[PDB]
Design an enzyme around this catalytic site. Structure first.
Site, PDB file in Angstrom:
ATOM      1  N   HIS A  25       0.805  -1.223   0.000  1.00 27.72           N
ATOM      2  CA  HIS A  25       0.000   0.000   0.000  1.00 27.72           C
ATOM      3  C   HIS A  25       0.838   1.274   0.000  1.00 27.72           C
ATOM      4  O   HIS A  25       0.241   2.356  -0.196  1.00 27.72           O
ATOM      5  CB  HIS A  25      -0.968  -0.006   1.193  1.00 27.72           C
ATOM      6  CG  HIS A  25      -2.359   0.516   0.990  1.00 27.72           C
ATOM      7  ND1 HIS A  25      -3.081   0.409  -0.174  1.00 27.72           N
ATOM      8  CD2 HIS A  25      -3.231   0.993   1.903  1.00 27.72           C
ATOM      9  CE1 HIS A  25      -4.314   0.883   0.024  1.00 27.72           C
ATOM     10  NE2 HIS A  25      -4.402   1.201   1.290  1.00 27.72           N
ATOM     11  N   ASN A  73      -6.306   6.381   4.689  1.00 28.06           N
ATOM     12  CA  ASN A  73      -7.716   6.709   4.528  1.00 28.06           C
ATOM     13  C   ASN A  73      -8.060   8.161   4.842  1.00 28.06           C
ATOM     14  O   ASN A  73      -9.237   8.520   4.701  1.00 28.06           O
ATOM     15  CB  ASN A  73      -8.619   5.744   5.265  1.00 28.06           C
ATOM     16  CG  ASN A  73      -8.584   5.900   6.749  1.00 28.06           C
ATOM     17  OD1 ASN A  73      -7.804   6.670   7.329  1.00 28.06           O
ATOM     18  ND2 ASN A  73      -9.299   4.994   7.373  1.00 28.06           N
ATOM     19  N   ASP A  98      -0.804   2.207  -5.335  1.00 31.49           N
ATOM     20  CA  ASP A  98      -0.946   0.789  -5.569  1.00 31.49           C
ATOM     21  C   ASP A  98      -2.274   0.497  -6.219  1.00 31.49           C
ATOM     22  O   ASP A  98      -3.321   1.062  -5.838  1.00 31.49           O
ATOM     23  CB  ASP A  98      -0.844   0.032  -4.271  1.00 31.49           C
ATOM     24  CG  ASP A  98      -1.769   0.472  -3.169  1.00 31.49           C
ATOM     25  OD1 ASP A  98      -1.725   1.702  -2.828  1.00 31.49           O
ATOM     26  OD2 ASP A  98      -2.465  -0.383  -2.558  1.00 31.49           O
ATOM     27  N   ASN A 119      -8.658   3.066  -0.646  1.00 33.36           N
ATOM     28  CA  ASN A 119      -9.133   3.881   0.441  1.00 33.36           C
ATOM     29  C   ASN A 119      -8.445   5.257   0.543  1.00 33.36           C
ATOM     30  O   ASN A 119      -8.974   6.168   1.149  1.00 33.36           O
ATOM     31  CB  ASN A 119      -9.090   3.215   1.821  1.00 33.36           C
ATOM     32  CG  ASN A 119      -7.745   2.764   2.401  1.00 33.36           C
ATOM     33  OD1 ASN A 119      -7.597   2.453   3.654  1.00 33.36           O
ATOM     34  ND2 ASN A 119      -6.743   2.651   1.595  1.00 33.36           N
TER      35      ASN A 119
HETATM   36 CL   LIG Z   1      -4.648   1.576   5.012  1.00 31.26          CL
END
Ligand SMILES: [Cl-]
Ligand SMILES: [Cl-]
Ligand SMILES: [Cl-]
Ligand code: NA
Ligand code: NA
Ligand code: NA
Ligand code: NA
Ligand code: NA
Ligand code: NA
Ligand code: NA
Ligand code: NA
Ligand code: NA
Ligand code: NA
Ligand code: NA
Ligand code: NA
Ligand code: NA
Length: 196
Positions: A25, A73, A98, A119
């Site tokens: 991520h 997020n 990503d 997110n």
């Molecule tokens: Cl996350």
């Protein structure tokens, strides 16, 4: 502010801290940190915009770099006020992230579209709209939806990491076209990348 679709803000998405730095991520952080090193752009603490940021010359263009330090997020809590303060329109923004829906070693440049479940993008698109550019760095999908956190917060095996590293390196070579506004040519040359 920004000028047309010359790219003048490059954002890398990720989570802060050593425990996340090697996770999938953080692919966007990898790209932007490597880009900053290539061009000698200092990434320095930017508490005002809840991130780490820099500014410097890429191929004769004044470009800003941003790594939100909000957690993924909450990325919009950095990207939105930063872009607004510097008067950078979405059309002049590249966000590296990503991409679950592409294989490791695949990389694509896309303009527009939704968050695709990501997110960090989900926290940005509601505010500035979709019309920014994305450097989609393939990381693969864990199969199921229950698993997405465990996949994206995992450290890829070496074969996958090598594939992603090669794709990222290729994209660094195409930033010159982006900061020049040659988005069509950049898209063709990025999306053509293959690992082998
Ligand atoms: Cl996350
Ligand atoms: Cl795409
Ligand atoms: Cl808003
Ligand atoms: Na610009
Ligand atoms: Na982020
Ligand atoms: Na530096
Ligand atoms: Na340069
Ligand atoms: Na973050
Ligand atoms: Na904020
Ligand atoms: Na990749
Ligand atoms: Na995208
Ligand atoms: Na994993
Ligand atoms: Na990884
Ligand atoms: Na490779
Ligand atoms: Na072009
Ligand atoms: Na063009």
């Amino acid at each position: 502010g920004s000028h047309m679709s010359n790219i003048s803000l490059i954002v890398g998405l990720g989570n802060p801290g050593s425990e996340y730095a090697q996770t999938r991520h953080n692919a966007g952080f990898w790209f932007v940190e490597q880009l900053a090193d290539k061009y000698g752009i200092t990434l320095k603490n930017d508490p005002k915009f809840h991130g780490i940021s820099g500014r410097g010359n890429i191929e004769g263009h004044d470009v800003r770099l941003l790594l939100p330090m909000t957690y993924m997020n909450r990325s919009g809590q950095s990207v939105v006020p930063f872009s607004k303060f510097y008067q950078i329109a979405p059309e002049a923004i590249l966000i590296a992230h990503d991409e679950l829906d592409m294989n490791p070693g695949v990389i694509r440049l896309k303009t527009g579209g939704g968050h695709g479940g990501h997110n960090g993008l989900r926290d940005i698109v509601p505010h500035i709209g979709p019309n920014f550019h994305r450097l989609r760095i393939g990381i693969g999908h864990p199969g199921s939806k229950e698993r997405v956190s465990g996949h994206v917060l995992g450290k890829a095996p070496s074969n996958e990491q090598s594939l992603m590293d090669g794709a990222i390196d290729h994209a660094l070579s195409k930033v010159k076209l982006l900061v020049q506004g040659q988005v069509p040519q950049a898209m063709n040359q990025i999306n053509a990348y293959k690992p082998a």
